[PDB]
Amino acid sequence: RLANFLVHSGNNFGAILSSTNVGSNTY
Amino acid sequence: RLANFLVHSGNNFGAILSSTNVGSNTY
Amino acid sequence: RLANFLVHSGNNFGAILSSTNVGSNTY
Amino acid sequence: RLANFLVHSGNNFGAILSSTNVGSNTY
Amino acid sequence: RLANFLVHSGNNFGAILSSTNVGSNTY
Amino acid sequence: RLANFLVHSGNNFGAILSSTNVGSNTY
Amino acid sequence: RLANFLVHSGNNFGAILSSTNVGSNTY
Amino acid sequence: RLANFLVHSGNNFGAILSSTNVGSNTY
Amino acid sequence: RLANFLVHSGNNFGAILSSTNVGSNTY
Amino acid sequence: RLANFLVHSGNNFGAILSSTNVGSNTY
Amino acid sequence: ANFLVHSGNNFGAILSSTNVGSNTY
Amino acid sequence: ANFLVHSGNNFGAILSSTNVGSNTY
Amino acid sequence: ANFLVHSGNNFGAILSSTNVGSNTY
Amino acid sequence: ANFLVHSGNNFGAILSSTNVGSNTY
Amino acid sequence: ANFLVHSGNNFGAILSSTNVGSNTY
């Protein structure tokens, strides 16, 4: 019985320019 | 019994320019 | 018995320009 | 019985330029 | 019974330029 | 008056999400 | 008056998330 | 008046998250 | 008046997170 | 008036986090 | 005499803004 | 005489801003 | 006489700003 | 006579700023 | 006569600033 939690809650990102893998969940 | 949770809740992104894989869930 | 959850709830995106894979779920 | 928690709550990012793997969860 | 917690709460990042692995959880 | 309630009394093995926008300018 | 309540009394093995925006300018 | 309550009385083995924005300019 | 309460009375084996922004300019 | 309370009376084996921003300019 | 010239300006996306790319007098 | 020239300016994204890329007099 | 010239300026992202890339007189 | 020249300036990201990349007189 | 020249300036990120990369007179 294995449980994996990847959560994003109430996060604010002002500006994202020429970036990669920002605010993402990767399994 | 395996459970995987990838959640995005209440996230705000002001501006995203020329970016990749922003605010995404990848399994 | 395997359950996978990829959820997007209440997310706001102001502007998305020339970007790829933004706010998406990929399995 | 194994449980893994990767959480992001109430984080603010002013500006992200030409960066990689910012504010992300990787399993 | 093993539990691993990787948490980010109330963190503020003013500006992130040409950086890698900032404010991220890696398992 | 605004009253927003999320009540849980049973056994939950899945995802329960609630998103609310009251009198807001959301982009 | 604003009243936001999250009440949990049962057994939870999953994710319970709540997001609220009241009178805000969200981008 | 603003009242934000998170109440937990049962057995929790998962994630319980709450995010609130009241009268804010969020980017 | 602002009242923010987090109350816990049961047995918690997981994550309980609360994030609040009241009358703020968040970037 | 601002009242921020975190009350714990039960048995906690996990993480309990609280983040609050009241009338602030956060970047 | 007052001369105002506006040319060749590219605007990506404008949200809830005022007096953008205009000749205001 | 007053001369104002605006040319070849690229703007990515503008949010809740005032007097951006404008000839204000 | 007053001469104001604006050319070849690249702006990435502008949020809650005033008088950006403008010829203000 | 007053001459103001602005050219070839790259701005990455601007947040809650005033009089950025402008010819203010 | 007054001459102000601005060229080839790279700005990474600007937050809550005033009179940045500008020709103020």
Residue numbers in the entry:
A (entry chain G), B (entry chain D), C (entry chain A), D (entry chain J), E (entry chain M), F (entry chain C), ...: 11 to 37
K (entry chain B), L (entry chain E), M (entry chain H), N (entry chain K), O (entry chain N): 13 to 37
Can I see the authors' text?
The fibrils present after 6 weeks, which represents the growth phase of fibril formation, are strikingly different to those observed at the 3-week time point. More surprisingly, and in marked contrast to the single structure solvable to high resolution at 3 weeks, six distinct fibril polymorphs could be identified at this time point. However, four fibril structures could be solved to high resolution (3.1–3.4 Å). The IAPP-S20G fibril polymorphs share a conserved two-protofilament (2PF) core, with one polymorph containing an additional peptide chain to make a 3PF fibril in which the additional chain has a different fold to those in the 2PF core. However, they share the ability to accrete new subunits to form additional protofilaments that lead to the generation of higher order fibril assemblies. This principle was suggested in our earlier work that first revealed the structures of 2PF and 3PF S20G-IAPP fibrils, but that study lacked the temporal (and spatial) resolution of the present study. Here, we describe structures that show that subunit accretion is a generic property of in vitro IAPP-S20G fibril assembly. Accretion of different subunits then builds larger fibril assemblies by different packing of these five subunit folds.
Human islet amyloid polypeptide (IAPP) is a 37-residue polypeptide hormone that is co-secreted with insulin from pancreatic β cells and plays an essential role in glycemic regulation. IAPP forms amyloid deposits in the pancreas of >90% of individuals with T2D.43–45 A single genetic mutation resulting in a serine to glycine substitution at residue 20 (IAPP-S20G) is associated with familial, early-onset T2D.46,47 Recently, cryo-EM structures of IAPP amyloid fibrils assembled in vitro for the wild-type (WT)48–50 sequence and IAPP-S20G48 have been determined, as well as those of patient-seeded WT IAPP. Here, we used cryo-EM to determine structures of amyloid fibrils at different times during in vitro fibrillation of a disease-related variant of human islet amyloid polypeptide (IAPP-S20G). Strikingly, the fibrils formed in the lag, growth, and plateau phases have different structures, with new forms appearing and others disappearing as fibrillation proceeds.
